[PDB]
């Protein structure tokens, strides 16, 4: 076969060890998803410095903890706008999952709290900027470079899915680069605990799996489809399905046709054809062999999965950082003043936060 007796023995043992790790990981997770944390700080504990990113319902800002001096990234969401966009469930999901997970490539939540106007989630500051920025700047990553990042997503999804969590917003915009050149997954706005299927239409058009577009109930296989889009985008410089109107994007996605740049390796196209597989019963990550159809694919043959997890692998690049409060790896956004209303807003909607 493709493996001799030595590699076959090592790989099987590795698989048993993954199962042992994941069972332990699920135990630790279940405690915090039953008994979340709440009210861990307050706004005046923090000096606010600069906006690191903006979204429809709030912003993320660099902040400094006054007593610690440590820098943090503070996500501020306007409670009324969240209610307005029917994002209450999603916001409560984000906080409760973030406080309960623990993995080297998942951003760590330090504090969370709320006031009359806003919800606050205070995360570890990841200074190297979004993959989005580095990718657009360089154009495309080499295959070894894309593979290093993709390997981190494969492991993160294996962990999340074993906890019955789906992520649902994979894209370069949500992947931060830390000081050692490794990925931090940020923004769990659409992450959700799911044991069977879930049904909300959400995500980003370019990354939506066909079953989301066709209004079916879906499961963790949409994350594996989204990994296929991510690897394509990283290696090509553009995603496999794009158009000026989302409806044209959706039409390309469901057609079950994808074209590849001529510089893609055959190993890469074979993996992507198996991830970008419209048929749910044939998509890699969703078969009897689970994530091992991905981890054992030829394109990942040079990947040392344990070494990646243990962060022993040299990164393709280290972001340039000239000091702990340096935001040069982030774009500049218009600053607005944080106003905290005299009256409590949407107090009942967010009782659990």
């Amino acid at each position: 076969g493709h493996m001799g007796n030595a590699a076959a023995a090592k790989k099987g043992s590795e698989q048993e060890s993954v199962k042992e790790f994941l069972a332990k990981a699920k135990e630790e997770f279940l405690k915090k998803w039953e008994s979340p944390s709440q009210n861990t700080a307050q706004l005046d504990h923090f000096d606010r410095i600069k906006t690191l990113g903006t979204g429809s319902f709030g912003r993320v800002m660099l902040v400094k903890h006054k007593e610690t001096g440590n820098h943090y990234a503070m996500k501020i969401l306007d409670k009324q706008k969240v209610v307005k966009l029917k994002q209450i469930e999603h916001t409560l999901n984000e906080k409760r999952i973030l406080q309960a997970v623990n993995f080297p490539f998942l951003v760590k939540l330090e504090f969370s709290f709320k006031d009359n106007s806003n919800l606050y989630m205070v995360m570890e500051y990841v200074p190297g900027g979004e993959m989005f920025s580095h990718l657009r700047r360089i154009g495309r990553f080499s295959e070894p470079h894309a593979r290093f990042y993709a390997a981190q997503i494969v492991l993160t999804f294996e962990y999340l899915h074993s906890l019955d969590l789906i992520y649902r917003d994979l894209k370069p915009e949500n992947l931060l680069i830390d000081q050692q050149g490794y990925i931090q997954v940020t923004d769990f706005g659409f992450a959700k605990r799911v044991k069977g299927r879930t049904w909300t239409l959400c995500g980003t058009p370019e990354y939506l799996a066909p079953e989301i577009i066709l209004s079916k109930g879906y499961n963790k296989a949409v994350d594996w489809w989204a990994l296929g889009v991510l690897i394509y985008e990283m290696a090509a410089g553009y995603p496999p399905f794009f158009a000026d109107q989302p409806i044209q994007i959706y039409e390309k996605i469901v057609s079950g046709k994808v074209r590849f740049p001529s510089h893609f390796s055959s190993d890469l196209k074979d993996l992507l054809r198996n991830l970008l597989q419209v048929d749910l019963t044939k998509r890699f990550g969703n078969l009897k062999n689970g994530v091992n159809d991905i981890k054992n694919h030829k394109w990942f043959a040079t990947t040392d999965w344990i070494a990646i997890y243990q962060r022993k692998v040299e990164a393709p690049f280290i972001p340039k950082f000239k000091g702990p409060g340096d935001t040069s790896n982030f774009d500049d956004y218009e600053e607005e003043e944080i106003r905290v209303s005299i009256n409590e807003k949407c107090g009942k909607e967010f009782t659990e936060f």
């Binding site: 989005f132 980003t204 090509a236 158009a243 000026d244």
Partner: peptide, 18 residues
């Protein structure tokens, strides 16, 4: 080229969720 068509499109910036 496909890349030029991409930069020419309105989908090269940060993509809002749906």
């Amino acid at each position: 080229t496909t890349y030029a068509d991409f930069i020419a499109s309105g989908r090269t910036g940060r993509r809002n969720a749906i």
